[PDB]
Design a binder for these strands. Structure first.
Ligand SMILES: [Mg+2]
Ligand SMILES: [Mg+2]
Lengths: 181, 201
DNA sequence: CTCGGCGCTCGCTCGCTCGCT
DNA sequence: GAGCGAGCGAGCGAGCGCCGA
């Protein structure tokens, strides 16, 4: 398994759940999700271009925070060296503003932000390990959890199913537990 | 507001000999009547080369920039090591991304026209001012305050000559009491502005 | 003193711009 | 038109001095 970049996108504050989902449609907010579906889809479209990675592994999760909606994008680093992630990410940020926001930049502070190895300045683009998904994304539960997308086989059935998340989390803790022997 | 590129050109202390007529040796400079400078401290032959450099640089600038009437301020100086010219030219018509290629056009022309195709020995004789002192910054844009801040304060013998089409510095180029006046006037504003900022928390 | 996060520097990277041929 | 390539400069990030704990 490869490393991942994390880009977090804040989203300003009629879908169906797939048959296999156990989630509560009543707790998923329609309007913000529609914005998020465009952002993730278009991000990944541009991502595939700059990285020359048509099959790029990704996991995206849309969450409802205490102050704003935020979307975690995890893309495989293959094809995009850390040294050039910035110049490519700025191209993508611009596409979104044009395609989704009619070319009016969102008011939201820090609304499109890569995850660095440090809080201040001078850090590096963080290569997030894939265990980030069970350790930190899978355990989210409604209403905080709002939606998720992936092309990673392990998580197809997990995106929108709370039981399957629960299982994979536990499957992970077991594996962790196994290495400690 | 007008922004300015800054090119800095070194001039040597040097088919030019005193044993025969030539465009450098033959020139003799007078101060305009309004000037309070000391002509004995101004070096005639470097001055003469320096005048030709800035003159030609400018007309080549008006070509690439497609901007006749482009604002400029140029000042020739005698330093510890070399003579040098600070050329300030308005950015209009030249996007920073293409300054280089145009500056190299001009640099080559000056080498052919003034140096007869023999590239100057001097180490970094034609260099544009960047936003950082090392590699990888952009071409610097300064505003007019750079003139009262860093060029007007010079006195002789460091100050040799100045040329400008800028209304406000016409009389200052070669009048020292004029420079002094404008420097005080500027510093006063800068000082009040400093106070005002400190008091604005 | 030790410790550690933060602000910041600077040699360096490398996809992009665009006048030129 | 096509595409070369010097010049571009935002981005990078290990390293380090500072400062409050
Ligand atoms: Mg999270
Ligand atoms: Mg000087």
């Amino acid at each position: 398994m490869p490393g991942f970049y994390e880009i977090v996108i804040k989203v300003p504050s009629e879908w169906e759940l797939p048959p296999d989902s156990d989630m509560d449609l009543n707790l998923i907010e329609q309007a913000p999700l529609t914005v998020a579906e465009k952002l993730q889809r278009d991000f990944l479209t541009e991502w595939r271009r700059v990285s020359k990675a048509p099959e790029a592994l990704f996991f995206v999760q849309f969450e409802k925070g205490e102050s704003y909606f935020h979307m975690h994008v995890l893309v495989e680093t293959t094809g995009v060296k850390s040294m050039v992630l910035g110049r490519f990410l700025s191209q993508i940020r611009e596409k979104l503003i044009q395609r989704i926001y009619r070319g009016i930049e969102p008011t939201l502070p820090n609304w499109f932000a890569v995850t660095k190895t440090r809080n201040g300045a001078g850090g590096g683009n963080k290569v997030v390990d894939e265990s980030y998904i069970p350790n930190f994304l899978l355990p989210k539960t409604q209403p905080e959890l709002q939606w998720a997308w992936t092309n990673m086989e392990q998580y197809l059935s997990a995106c929108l199913n709370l039981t399957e998340r629960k299982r994979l989390v536990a499957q992970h803790l077991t594996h962790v537990s196994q290495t400690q022997e």
